[PDB]
Design a protein around this motif. Structure first.
Motif, PDB file in Angstrom:
ATOM      1  N   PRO A  49      33.511  18.633 101.608  1.00 21.79           N
ATOM      2  CA  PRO A  49      34.462  18.310 100.528  1.00 21.79           C
ATOM      3  C   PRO A  49      35.889  18.737 100.832  1.00 21.79           C
ATOM      4  N   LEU A  50      36.086  19.971 101.287  1.00 21.46           N
ATOM      5  CA  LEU A  50      37.425  20.486 101.576  1.00 21.46           C
ATOM      6  C   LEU A  50      37.820  20.265 103.038  1.00 21.46           C
ATOM      7  N   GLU A  51      37.633  19.035 103.513  1.00 22.46           N
ATOM      8  CA  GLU A  51      37.974  18.679 104.884  1.00 22.46           C
ATOM      9  C   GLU A  51      38.362  17.209 104.927  1.00 22.46           C
ATOM     10  N   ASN A  52      39.333  16.883 105.783  1.00 22.00           N
ATOM     11  CA  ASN A  52      39.753  15.493 105.981  1.00 22.00           C
ATOM     12  C   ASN A  52      40.201  15.352 107.438  1.00 22.00           C
ATOM     13  N   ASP A  53      39.279  14.896 108.286  1.00 26.31           N
ATOM     14  CA  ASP A  53      39.547  14.702 109.707  1.00 26.31           C
ATOM     15  C   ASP A  53      38.883  13.420 110.196  1.00 26.31           C
ATOM     16  N   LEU A  54      39.005  12.346 109.421  1.00 21.87           N
ATOM     17  CA  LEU A  54      38.374  11.084 109.784  1.00 21.87           C
ATOM     18  C   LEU A  54      39.122  10.415 110.932  1.00 21.87           C
ATOM     19  N   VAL A  55      38.369   9.768 111.818  1.00 26.29           N
ATOM     20  CA  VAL A  55      38.920   9.017 112.941  1.00 26.29           C
ATOM     21  C   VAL A  55      38.694   7.535 112.677  1.00 26.29           C
ATOM     22  N   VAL A  56      39.759   6.745 112.789  1.00 29.46           N
ATOM     23  CA  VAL A  56      39.738   5.323 112.460  1.00 29.46           C
ATOM     24  C   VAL A  56      39.818   4.520 113.751  1.00 29.46           C
ATOM     25  N   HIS A  57      38.937   3.532 113.885  1.00 28.22           N
ATOM     26  CA  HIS A  57      38.928   2.666 115.054  1.00 28.22           C
ATOM     27  C   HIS A  57      39.878   1.492 114.856  1.00 28.22           C
ATOM     28  N   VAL A  58      40.650   1.183 115.896  1.00 23.98           N
ATOM     29  CA  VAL A  58      41.623   0.097 115.870  1.00 23.98           C
ATOM     30  C   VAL A  58      41.420  -0.763 117.110  1.00 23.98           C
ATOM     31  N   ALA A  59      41.382  -2.080 116.919  1.00 24.60           N
ATOM     32  CA  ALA A  59      41.171  -3.034 117.999  1.00 24.60           C
ATOM     33  C   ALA A  59      42.449  -3.826 118.243  1.00 24.60           C
ATOM     34  N   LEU A  60      42.799  -4.004 119.514  1.00 21.38           N
ATOM     35  CA  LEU A  60      43.988  -4.744 119.918  1.00 21.38           C
ATOM     36  C   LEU A  60      43.588  -6.141 120.371  1.00 21.38           C
ATOM     37  N   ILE A  61      44.157  -7.158 119.724  1.00 19.73           N
ATOM     38  CA  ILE A  61      43.899  -8.556 120.053  1.00 19.73           C
ATOM     39  C   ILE A  61      45.233  -9.287 120.125  1.00 19.73           C
TER      40      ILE A  61
END
Lengths: 132, 1001, 78
Positions: free
Chosen positions: B446-458
């Motif tokens: 709950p007291l954490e925010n370290d999400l990694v987001v995937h991004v694709a290059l086209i």
């Protein structure tokens, strides 16, 4: 709540009085309807009593589509004695002798006591007369 | 004594109390136990069914039950089938509400229990209520998860889908409230309620991804849910949660939304403060009152006026009725929180107030009232006298909801079952299990925010791809991604429109609405083909601000932040970015290089990002299935060329190359002839579209804005901005400076707002519409990311803002002519707006600061409470600029913190024409408040004239400058606006002098 | 490992009625062999059913399950 009056009153057949009944841990037996002298006088004749017994035994032994052996209670009343009241009528004694030895009318009739018949006879458990 | 005796006692209690009055024709319980009432509510019967189901679950633990579970389960099934049948009886209203939500089209909530038909018209009830539908959905999914069977055919699945679609839009339409009264004034108005939206959020979360048929189901038992609606509902809750409504500081109806029936508030500390506040402000000797100043069925209440007269609420206080049912709810909360001390204290409190029948059965009366003898004695000493029980407390009348809650609470207290059994769907979880739940919390804690987001290059074109590769940037043109398909956003909306269609009843399915970035971040499979879509920010837009690289960079950063902070689903999100060869446009090619390099580095403003080929990312990832489809300067002026003949204008259009002249000629042609006229380049509309697109390519801001005004177009995001402004507590006015203005106080349909804004636009100016569009989108974005910058704002006015903008730009120009605002680039207008919106500092002329503060209608923090404490100590009143504020009505109608007073004081203050004059007035009011609160000995003898005081200060400072700088008497008080409030000789000292002079006399 | 409060509906360890309880109800089925025996029992009120009246169901001895279990777990390579 639904304004239902239940089953209306009707005359009860001989097929229902034959079987035993259970009402609040008690055993009850009902006599046949044709020995009722408070409805009509046709039951005051011994010969007619004999003929209704014969036809009713025949009808009972005919179908009997329900499980177990039948049971008929035939009380002997004060009206079926003679004029002097010291002996039963000849017709009644003769009918008793015929229903002994296991052949009366058109059916086999076996005699005994309610003690022996209770172990082998259909019993119907009634639940709707239990207290609410 | 074994369990048999206790369970038989509960059975006889239920038979003699709850199931006795059940209606076999419908399975719905009535609202009255006597008199043959034909009225039935939804909440009470539903609660009784829930209690019966709980009792059946409790008795299920016996293998020799003699079938006692049977009648309870079948009673619950019959009640639910009846309520479902009654809901499905009305079909036209659902379709009407799905498109135009209004009280006229609202679903009816009360109907005859004998035959399931309406008995009362909607003009005397309102009939609009959503909490019942949400609670019914939550309970039905509850018993489906339990193991009960209520649905039979696929038609009911479609009906549930339509109901979900209808309830998705609850966060905007106001409701009548749980108590049916809505506002405390009870005049016939609807206000937003936090409990209803909380119940809607809970039901929406629970209904997601669940098999409705129970044990067996493959592809026609699932429910589809949009995450954007859930996110907006959560935002509305978090904004409105501290105060249940604008007109209600606190109500007792908040408990069920924040207790066992919901379990919706996962904030612990805010939960604790809400519980403490409601307990402290609503505790009573006999239980909990509904809320403060409530004359509900009290002694003074009379059955002759449905709507309360103003100032009657002041007389109605202190005699509020009492409901002991909420002791049972607090008992429930305590027992699920494992606090036996609260259990024992509330049981001890409940024991004496409970009543008995002839046989001694427990009774819980509805409300408590005080006799007429203690109408005034109770006021002096709260709770000193003894109240009297209601009619439904002795015999012949019961409150089935009350005994249902009492029996369920007693069942839980006796420990005959476990909390898990009564909640198989684990609505409530402890703090140590909140680690890997869906739709609520993230795996990081709950007291954490370290999400990694995937991004694709086209890439888009091969030439652009090789050009980027020459500089080291790696990208893939779409023709090597053949197994995967990239589709725009309209494919998904048309697909969603395809589903939810039934022929027998008449069904339009999901309305055609835009899909948020969270929905498009997923991966779809249509007809066995993978489908991936990019956010709506990259598609071609007829608007002009999409041609600025800085705006796109800021927008994509905002989207990345929004994805990071509102993502909770299993699996990393997928983001697709497209680059066009037209974006480079020569020298503009540097910032995109910098952004791509930063993206390759790995961090974008504190957000971690990953880049790789699309094939690796799509492989090994969960893809969601959609299988429903298979089953189914200008040289032309207006005045000079207005009277020219048609042929001359056509020839001038032919032989002219200037864009502004072409646009103005097209405007004259459309105004005179019409859009259906035929020109040399096709129809008038086609020529307008072509010239507008050419201007957009050429980036002529005035030309594109004028063409946009022609095109009769609007952004599809105004409604979220207006509704978030409304739920914040601010007000929005649309209009032009110095002209008529329209005020908005409640959410409205886009059609009405578009109509009114465009009629105003036709009345006064030409290119304004796009200007207010740009200002409102910028202001909404800034308030979304920087909420504290707009602190102190109540009424936001775009015309006054843009006038202050133009004035500041003119000051900055100085000797050079002021640059026209229509020709400013989006980056320039954004920067200038951020500069003017700043808290501002010294250096500049204090008059300009006063002007910009007054134009924004700035108010000091705590001004409203200061005004209120002034009026409480002002026996006569305050008169400013001809407006009167009588003390008696505002003291007898209003209280400390309610918004109606703030609206009234703003209304009476807004009559001042000069904004800096208004700021001087508010500063004087603050000084008066401070000086009067510091000393209570001095009191006003009569009403004060603020104009007289400011005129006296005017004369005194004129004398002071005459003495010091030898300046003669000069008209106008502008030198005062120049003079700062504080310093050697400021305005505050003169305000204090005037106050001292007034008090001395 | 489960706590003392959770041992209520676990499989192969505890019964649904609780650890310190034993009130199981077992089912029995009455099936006769021959028509003469079943009619003789019915004459005394005893109810029993001939094996020829349960055609959808089949009754097999214990060696059938033994040979079926023997059939299982056969591999040719090893």
């Amino acid at each position: 709540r639904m304004k239902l009056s239940g089953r209306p009153y009707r005359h009860m057949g001989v097929l229902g009085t034959s079987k035993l009944y259970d009402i609040r841990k008690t055993i009850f037996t009902f006599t046949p309807q044709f020995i009722d002298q408070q409805q009509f006088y046709l039951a005051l004749d011994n010969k007619m009593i004999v003929e209704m017994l014969r036809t009713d035994l025949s009808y009972l032994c005919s179908r009997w589509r329900m499980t177990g052996q039948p049971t008929i209670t035939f009380p002997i009343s004060h009206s079926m004695l003679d004029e002097d009241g010291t002996s039963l009528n000849s017709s009644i004694l003769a009918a008793l002798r015929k229903m002994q030895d296991g052949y009366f009318g058109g059916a086999r009739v076996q005699t005994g006591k309610l003690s022996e018949f209770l172990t082998t006879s259909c019993c119907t458990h009634l639940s709707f007369m239990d207290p609410g | 004594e074994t369990l048999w005796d206790k369970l038989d006692h509960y059975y006889r209690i239920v038979k003699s109390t709850l199931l006795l009055y059940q209606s076999p024709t419908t399975g719905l319980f009535p609202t009255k136990t006597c008199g043959g009432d034909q009225k039935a509510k939804i909440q009470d019967s539903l609660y009784c069914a829930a209690g019966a189901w709980a009792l059946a679950l409790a008795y299920r633990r016996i293998d020799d039950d003699k079938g006692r579970t049977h009648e309870l389960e079948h009673s619950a099934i019959k009640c639910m089938r009846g309520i479902l049948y009654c809901y499905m009886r009305q079909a036209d209203k659902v379709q009407q509400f799905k498109q135009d939500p209004r009280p006229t089209t609202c679903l009816h909530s009360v109907f005859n229990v004998h035959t399931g038909d309406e008995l009362l018209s909607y003009e005397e009830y309102g009939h609009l209520q959503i909490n019942a539908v949400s609670l019914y959905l939550l309970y039905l999914v509850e018993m489906i998860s339990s193991g009960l069977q209520i649905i039979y055919n696929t038609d009911e699945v479609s009906f549930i889908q339509n109901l979900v679609f209808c309830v998705e839009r609850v966060y905007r339409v106001p409701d009548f409230g749980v108590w049916e009264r809505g506002s405390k004034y009870n005049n016939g108005s609807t206000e937003l309620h936090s409990s209803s939206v909380g119940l809607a959020k809970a039901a929406l979360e629970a209904i997601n991804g669940f098999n409705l048929f129970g044990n067996q189901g493959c592809s026609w038992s699932v429910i589809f849910v949009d995450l954007d609606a859930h996110n907006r509902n959560r935002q509305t809750l978090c904004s409105l949660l501290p105060r249940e409504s604008r007109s209600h500081n606190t109500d007792a109806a908040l408990l069920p939304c924040i207790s066992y029936p919901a379990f919706a508030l996962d904030d612990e500390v805010l939960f604790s403060q809400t519980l403490d506040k409601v307990v402290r402000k609503l505790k009573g000797k006999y239980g909990f009152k509904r809320f403060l100043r409530d004359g509900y069925r009290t002694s003074l209440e009379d059955p002759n006026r449905c709507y309360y007269k103003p100032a009657e609420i002041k007389l109605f206080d202190g005699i509020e009725c009492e409901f002991p049912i909420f002791f049972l709810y607090m008992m429930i909360d305590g027992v699920f929180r494992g606090n036996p001390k609260q259990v024992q204290e509330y049981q001890d409190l409940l024991t004496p107030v409970l009543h008995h029948t002839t046989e001694g059965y427990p009774v819980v009366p509805k409300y408590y009232y005080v006799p007429a003898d203690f109408v005034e004695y109770e006021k002096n000493n709260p709770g000193s006298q003894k109240r009297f029980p209601s009619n439904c407390g002795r015999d012949g009348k019961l409150f089935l909801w009350g005994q249902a809650l009492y029996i369920i609470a007693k069942l839980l207290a006796d420990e005959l079952i476990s909390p898990k059994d009564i909640d198989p769907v684990q609505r409530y979880v402890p703090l140590k299990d909140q680690r890997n739940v869906s739709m609520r919390f993230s795996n990081q804690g709950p007291l954490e925010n370290d999400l990694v987001v995937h991004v694709a290059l086209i890439a888009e074109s091969q030439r652009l791809q090789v050009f980027l590769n020459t500089y080291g940037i790696q990208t893939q043109t779409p023709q090597q991604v053949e197994p995967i398909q990239i589709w725009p956003q309209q494919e998904l909306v048309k697909a969603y429109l395809q589903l939810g269609i039934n022929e027998k009843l008449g069904l339009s399915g999901r309305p055609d609405r835009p899909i948020g970035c969270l929905g498009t971040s997923k991966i779809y499979r249509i007809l066995g083909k993978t489908v991936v879509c990019y956010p709506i920010i990259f598609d071609l837009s007829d608007f002009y601000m999409s041609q600025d690289v800085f705006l796109l960079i800021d927008d994509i950063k905002n989207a990345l932040q929004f994805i990071k902070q509102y993502w909770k689903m299993h699996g990393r999100p997928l983001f697709l970015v497209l680059i066009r060869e037209d974006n480079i446009r020569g020298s503009r090619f540097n910032p995109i290089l910098d952004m791509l390099a930063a993206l390759k580095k790995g961090i974008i403003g504190g957000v971690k990002v990953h880049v790789d080929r699309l094939q690796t990312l799509i492989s090994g990832a969960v893809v969601e299935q959609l299988d429903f489809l298979r089953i189914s300067q200008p040289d032309v002026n207006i005045s000079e060329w207005k009277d020219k003949p048609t042929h001359e204008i056509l020839q001038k259009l032919n032989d002219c190359s200037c864009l502004a002249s072409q646009a103005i000629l097209l405007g004259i042609l459309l105004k005179r002839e019409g859009p259906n006229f035929i020109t040399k380049e096709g129809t008038v509309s086609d020529h307008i579209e072509r010239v507008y697109r050419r201007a957009g390519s050429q980036k002529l801001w005035l030309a594109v804005r004028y063409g946009a005004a022609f095109t009769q177009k609007f952004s599809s995001s105004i409604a979220p901005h207006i509704t978030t402004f409304l739920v914040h507590g601010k007000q929005v006015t649309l209009g032009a400076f110095g002209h008529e203005e329209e005020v908005i106080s409640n959410p409205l349909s886009p059609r009405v707002i578009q109509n009114i804004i465009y009629y105003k636009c036709n009345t006064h100016d030409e290119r304004e519409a796009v200007i207010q569009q740009e200002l409102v989108i910028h202001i909404g974005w800034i308030i979304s990311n920087n909420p504290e910058l707009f602190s102190g704002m109540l009424k936001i006015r775009i015309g006054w803002i843009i006038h202050a903008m133009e004035y500041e730009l003119q000051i900055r120009g100085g000797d050079k002519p002021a640059l026209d605002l229509y020709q400013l680039s989006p980056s320039e207008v954004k920067q200038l707006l951020l500069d003017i919106l700043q808290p501002q500092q010294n250096g500049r002329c204090w008059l300009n600061r006063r002007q910009i503060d007054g134009s924004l209608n700035r108010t000091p923090t705590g001004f409203y409470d200061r005004v209120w404490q002034i009026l409480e100590r002002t026996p006569n009143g305050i008169i400013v600029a001809g407006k009167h504020l009588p003390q008696q009505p505002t003291l007898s109608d209003m209280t400390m913190y309610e918004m109606n007073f703030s609206l009234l004081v703003e209304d009476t203050l807004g009559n001042i024409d000069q904004p800096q004059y208004r700021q001087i007035v508010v500063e004087l009011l603050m000084v008066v408040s401070i000086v009067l609160e510091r000393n209570p000995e001095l009191e006003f003898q009569d009403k004060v004239d603020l104009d007289r005081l400011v005129k006296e200060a005017f004369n005194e400072f004129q004398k002071d400058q005459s003495r010091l700088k030898e300046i003669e008497k000069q008209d106008d008080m502008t030198s005062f606006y120049n003079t700062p409030p504080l310093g050697k000789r400021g305005t505050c000292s003169y305000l204090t002098k005037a106050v001292m002079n007034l008090l001395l006399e």
